[PDB]
Symmetry: D2
Subunit: 294 residues, 4 copies
């Protein structure tokens, strides 16, 4: 049966985490590491195990770790964590939690970066801008086997909430037209895409940042996406994200696959001649889900 419980929106902010250094750079991005003067993460934790059943069927709380205590667990482990990535932090929390509570058979963690951008001061080492734009993500699932060994069964890293608009050099023509079609063909649209991008490594260890040369930074994925979007006379969103995926896998052969969840929020044209003027479209949004592997 499905049987899990836990805690969501566990925010944790750490100052002066160990800097991320020695990353492999790529052409699309100036990214070369993270100072980690300020490091914030939003964590959601889910745990299960068959011995949790009576907490549901009988109201027996004997084996119930309070979700409040899980919040505490996560917050204190951020204080003790000696690594450099959100992926590595999740692995630290998972391993530690399962070693602590032996009746838990499965733990699933999601981590979302709270991004902070640098600011100018007469670049500050003290003042940061809390950003509401794109942010790194990490996902980890770990199990306790019947021989009491622990194994990672899933790991995925990501970039969420990237909103890109290309003002020209985009088309969407040639699609099916029939009784339900009113969309006109457009040989030059200002394509607006909302991108979530997730990748899996060939070797799960590479995500931890232990050998930083192998670590794929979300910042680098961001810049690949904007470069490829720029370079490409897009034929659809589908066309674009395939090519973004291919470029990612070329740049990072230590990656096994890249997953995209994209949305289309392209503006409606109001004045064609006239520069041009556009407006926000109605609520319905197009979306695409696609994996490139490898």
């Amino acid at each position: 049966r499905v049987m899990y419980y836990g805690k969501g929106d566990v925010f944790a902010y750490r100052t002066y985490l160990k800097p991320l250094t020695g990353v492999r750079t790529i052409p699309e991005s100036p990214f070369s590491g993270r100072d980690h003067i300020l490091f914030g993460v939003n964590v959601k934790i889910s745990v299960g195990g068959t011995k949790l059943l009576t907490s549901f069927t009988k109201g027996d709380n004997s084996l119930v770790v309070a979700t409040d205590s899980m919040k505490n667990f996560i917050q204190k482990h951020l204080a003790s964590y000696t690594g450099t990535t959100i992926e590595g932090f999740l692995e630290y929390v998972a391993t530690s939690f399962l070693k602590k509570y032996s009746h838990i058979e499965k733990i699933s963690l999601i981590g979302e970066e709270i991004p902070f951008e640098t600011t100018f001061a007469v670049a500050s080492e003290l003042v940061f801008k809390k950003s509401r734009n794109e942010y790194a993500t990490a996902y980890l699932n770990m199990v306790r086997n019947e021989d009491n060994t622990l194994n990672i069964t899933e790991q995925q890293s990501g970039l969420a909430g990237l909103q890109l608009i290309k003002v020209s050099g985009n088309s969407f023509v040639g699609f099916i037209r029939d009784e339900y079609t009113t969309l006109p063909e457009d040989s030059n649209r200002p394509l607006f895409v909302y991108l979530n991008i997730k990748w899996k490594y060939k070797n799960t260890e590479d995500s931890f940042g232990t050998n930083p040369e192998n670590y794929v930074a979300a910042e680098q994925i961001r810049d690949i996406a904007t470069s490829v979007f720029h370079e490409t006379e897009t034929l659809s969103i589908q066309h674009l994200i395939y090519l973004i995926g291919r470029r990612i896998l070329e740049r990072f052969p230590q990656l096994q696959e890249v997953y995209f969840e994209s949305q289309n929020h392209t503006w409606d044209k109001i004045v064609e001649e006239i520069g041009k003027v556009y407006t926000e479209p109605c609520p319905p949004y197009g979306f695409q889900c696609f994996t490139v592997t490898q």
Copy 2:
């Protein structure tokens, strides 16, 4: 993974065939829906191997524009002759796959936009208006449907799920959370009497998918009835935890509705912190952002 589609397709229909002839339960006065106003928010996703080249080559020759999917959904609400969201989804899914023979799989999510009745004084009395309705942001019915086209051009449903989403319930007393693990990570006090606040999403699956459509309404399980089972069971129960509560809600649901196979709960704990203990009244406030949650299925095996 290869899918594409359209979200936030809103469609509002006036004078849909009413839902009546349902079977009642003790926990609920629900007797049907007059459907003067019927509103749904639909998400559609489609797949098929023949869509590959739309990604790999930028060839749109087999692409149904998602804008067309929108039009398809909205136009089908106009010709829908059925009485439920679940049935509406089945109607759209079947029509869509019949229309687009190169599409192999479709997935539909429908969320009710709920409307509540209002009062008017007309012709000398105060009574429920047949014209003016209040749009509600509280709990709402949901439906989910996945259908495939087989090689012989027949269509099959491969998953169906109905639901009640967004139910926010607070019980002011008669709840405890004691006896949980207290170790070096614990700062939560034991509480023999708390005002438990739960956010509930309840999802059910039928033993026979046909019962979901409302064609034989006596087998249809209405989200409004599930709502009322949830509020009745909460009231009846000296709860020992949210875990304990949702098990008892699922048991009552499956006892009342033998046509159902299982019930799934996604619940969140948003219980208030106490500020003033004495003082029969008390004062509480909103807690901080972290929220507890539970994910649990009650099945046939849990029934005696």
Copy 3:
């Protein structure tokens, strides 16, 4: 300008003194509030010339911590012996200015957290539960109060306003919008029969502020009653615009409640776009721009 304070101070009280003894109107079955559960979201703003140096010198000696204001509000809900949000604000405002003599002005907004009854089966029958309530995200009552301390240490109310916020009403037929200006900027078709959708905020003021408190409940205007007037008038009326509609709602309010001085409307149009005209019909959500109207109905408009 110089004010500071605290927002989103939530406070939930059980078994507040019930509101009863209100006067009824034909449009509403409202008979009072049992107040098993009473919830409010409060915002407090304070001002005073003596706060200046907290800004200009970083001197905090006359600063009431905004955290302490939160405690103040939450604690006073515990001691409040009244029956309305309006009276709760007056109690908080009066106590606060009495406590902090260097504060010259205080502004308070209270927003009801509304809860609805649910059914339970117990002791053999199905009936309204006295324990389980549904938190509502729909329309909610509001209150506003400004008070000052005068030189002789007396207190005066300088503005009071009550309201109903977030009422979303759709009337499926019996609405028109025709005869408006049609020029080089006009692409809206005339429509003799539209399903008008209005988002309503309605705010009223009393001729005597004391009537707002609930102390003499027969003079109190409940937001629930205003709600039912709005739905009733919307129903009764072959509307010619939202402008037309809200004028007639205001007229009915002022006619039913002669203790009210004026009623203010902030309305928004969210009327759906028609997709199918002949089948019942089908509509969908419009694009993001929304029309709005801001209008006060007053005594002179009566009757």
Copy 4:
């Protein structure tokens, strides 16, 4: 009463607006102008006039400009606007609207910038791909009236920067405040102050807001950078103390300004671990705020 109506969430995007150039720089900010390859604004329009009364009282739509038409007016006017600022775009719309509809006595415009940031492409800044930002954005406010002699006058103008979220990890205190029966807040000599800032300013001379003489225009980007520089430089004693100092620096850098208004909120984290860097967490819902005007 009060009698207005209008349209909100009128979004309008323009490509290749005339670029803003020739701006006076300041120490705190690298800002030198705007390419305007992509310009977006969210407009709200409100209009009034005594002759609109019967549209309310009688259901007479004869003098009603449909709010839908107002939307069209704004979008069309962005197509023909030859200027370089949101402030200037609001004056263009206001003047043109009043000149068109003589029975309208007052118009109020709010413009909010939809900010777009530059992106990388291969190895330089893209002239085609921009990132839509949910962070801080420029604002403008304009009120214009027709007088009884049929002259038009601007009665209020205000520029702004909204939505700026700054956190300073150390070098902030909050001590010495009133302690009584209602105080539980401990004194803190070193907190990680998190402020949410809205900053609004008014010019001595309204025409300076339009950008016609760029050297006199005050850009929201410049205000942003002053705010972060001052926050950096200052061992703050309160949010009140900080925003006064930010205000003072703005008025010294920009003597063409008459005033600066602040609406700030305090969202500082709770400390969980003091001794390990430190660890903090998100506070509960209540938020402190401050409202203050600094004048010249």
